[PDB]
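Lab intake sheet, docking and co-folding queue.

SAMPLE TYPE: protein with bound small molecule
LIGAND NAME: ATU
LIGAND FORMAT: SMILES
REQUESTED OUTPUT: full 3D complex as structure tokens
PRIORITY: normal
SUBMITTED BY: R.K., bench team

The fields below were copied directly from the construct record.
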Amino acid sequence: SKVTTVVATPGQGPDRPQEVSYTDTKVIGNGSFGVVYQAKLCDSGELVAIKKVLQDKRFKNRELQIMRKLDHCNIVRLRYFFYSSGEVYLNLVLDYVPETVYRVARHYSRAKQTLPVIYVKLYMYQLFRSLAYIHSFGICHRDIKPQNLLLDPDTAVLKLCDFGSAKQLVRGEPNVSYICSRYYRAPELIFGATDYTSSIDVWSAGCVLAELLLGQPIFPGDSGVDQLVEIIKVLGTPTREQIREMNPNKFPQIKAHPWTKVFRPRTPPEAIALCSRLLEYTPTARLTPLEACAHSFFDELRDPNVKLPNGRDTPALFNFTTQELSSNPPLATILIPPHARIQA
Amino acid sequence: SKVTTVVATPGQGPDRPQEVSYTDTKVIGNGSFGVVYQAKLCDSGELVAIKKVLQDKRFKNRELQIMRKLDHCNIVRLRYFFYSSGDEVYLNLVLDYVPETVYRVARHYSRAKQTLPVIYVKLYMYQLFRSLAYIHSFGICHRDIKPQNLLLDPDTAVLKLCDFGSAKQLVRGEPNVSYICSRYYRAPELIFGATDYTSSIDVWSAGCVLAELLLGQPIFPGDSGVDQLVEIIKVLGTPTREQIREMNPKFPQIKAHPWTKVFRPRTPPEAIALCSRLLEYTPTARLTPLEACAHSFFDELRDPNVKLPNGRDTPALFNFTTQELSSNPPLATILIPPHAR
Ligand SMILES: O=C1Cc2c([nH]c3ccc([N+](=O)[O-])cc23)-c2ccccc2N1
Ligand SMILES: O=C1Cc2c([nH]c3ccc([N+](=O)[O-])cc23)-c2ccccc2N1
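RESULT FIELD (auto-filled):
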């Protein structure tokens, strides 16, 4: 079988060129930006994904510069990056994860079942950790959706991926409002706001949580108008002031439709509570990623005896860094449970 | 079975209600605005669709107001309208029922690995452009042109534009929301968030429907606006800074993909030519609905001997009114062929 050898720059270490060899190359994605292949590293035999993008000589690649400064257990890792031609192409060698929340959720959905809540807790918590981390650098993902949430079935580790839309948001600087996928767009983006903040990622994460609980997207619609109608059916009509906070300079008025009426009976009240605090019209009213992690809905993950259904221990959930906690250090008293603090 | 009698107001003419009875009611759709039922008029036996929408009684329904004013062979007709309740009040629009949609017809061919015969692409697109020329002559923009809102009668090949729930009279200098129009059919200026767009957004949408019928699939798919723009750039090429200015409100620099390379071989050159004149970055550069009708791609419909594959004659295609031609009267010399009475 064919073996390709390239010389690449390490994704995060010091600039020490490495000779990398991979085989069994095969396509696994064709997203507008470029091609996403899967390959097998000759030596270790580990699987990797290679995102190949056309590199504009005009400017430096934004995804690459962002990926180079990230190092977190819940963010897909950039192992190496090198250029080729076959025309100038940037290749990003990333860790390959077997599943996605999108595929897992679809499997349960067409089997008429919902994902056990223990998994909803583990997945959402890890997503909020990854967001707390990138937001601490002022970086907004801008495309949070089930397809960009990679999962390892056995360990239950979740990893945020695809930073092709990510960007450092600077106060006072305008940003395009046409990023983010259909069902997951915050109201301010639908209204065309250009001064939105990182809280749009929080709205998107809230849509993912509601979707895992419901078994289907919570705010579907092929047009922004249809999406807003679904949002209004649940949150109610926006006050003129809330519309002002979403920013952008006439819908059939409806009242506060209980969130308890939204999900099936049995749904943990804490899950419903969390959704209501994430999916808020006013962007400043939504919980921050870190506050979300500290929410009572995730208390079970902080119990000393918690275990995965398959018997294994839960993945690392409390190894927080100073960087991660910077938005609100005091939260550590809740985020790091007593038993994770025993010195032994 | 069950018979329902209401006192309904005729869609057109003097506001004079009459008793109307209907039977065989059944849900046939669930839209965001409201349920859509089918029913049979007890007198005529004709089938009708009834759209029920919650009515904020302190204001006049815009869809109703626009519909009461429209009368065209290629626009679904508002037969009657009436109110009912469930302390909540509903406006019920009694519209003519049409058996098919371009969406369903196209899907049928698509999953059978075939494409709709071009004679139908011509008939359907021409009728859609006639309906657009008509509503635009009143300054009304549909704002949601897509396969699902194009009704079809299989036997006569008559097409009727429907669902005016997003339609609005566009007034120069007045701002309009940019979040109307469905995903694959949104003009670039809407994707960029323009608030001063014109009726030409309907033309871009119609161009997307034409390309889709020729291709067998949507031409500018994508779950985010960014993805949609990439697909648009792959075909039209990168927008000049000026074209971006005309659309109003950091992309790679790809060059124009020859339109002929876009469709399968065999595709009529005129079809390709029409698409390129509809799908233009600069909104003022796109053909007007009336100019589109007069395009050479539709010449076959103007041939005296044209017939539908099923042997029947084509539907009415030349009965233009002064209102319809107002944007450019001289086009009548092309629009109404010599043989046309
Ligand atoms: O590591 C990957 C690569 C990968 C998947 N989806 C993605 C979306 C975006 C990107 N990306 O690099 O941007 C990679 C991936 C994907 C899909 C199915 C199964 C496994 C899986 N895993
Ligand atoms: O006249 C209708 C009503 C109807 C269809 N689609 C629609 C989309 C919008 C509206 N509307 O009133 O807005 C009515 C309809 C539809 C669908 C399948 C088969 C026939 C058909 N016919």
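REVIEWER NOTE: The interface with chain A takes residues 32-33, 53-56, 144, 146, 166, 175, 177-183, 191-193, 195, 222-227, 229-231, 252-253 of chain B (CB under 8 Å).
SIGN-OFF: pending second check by T.M.
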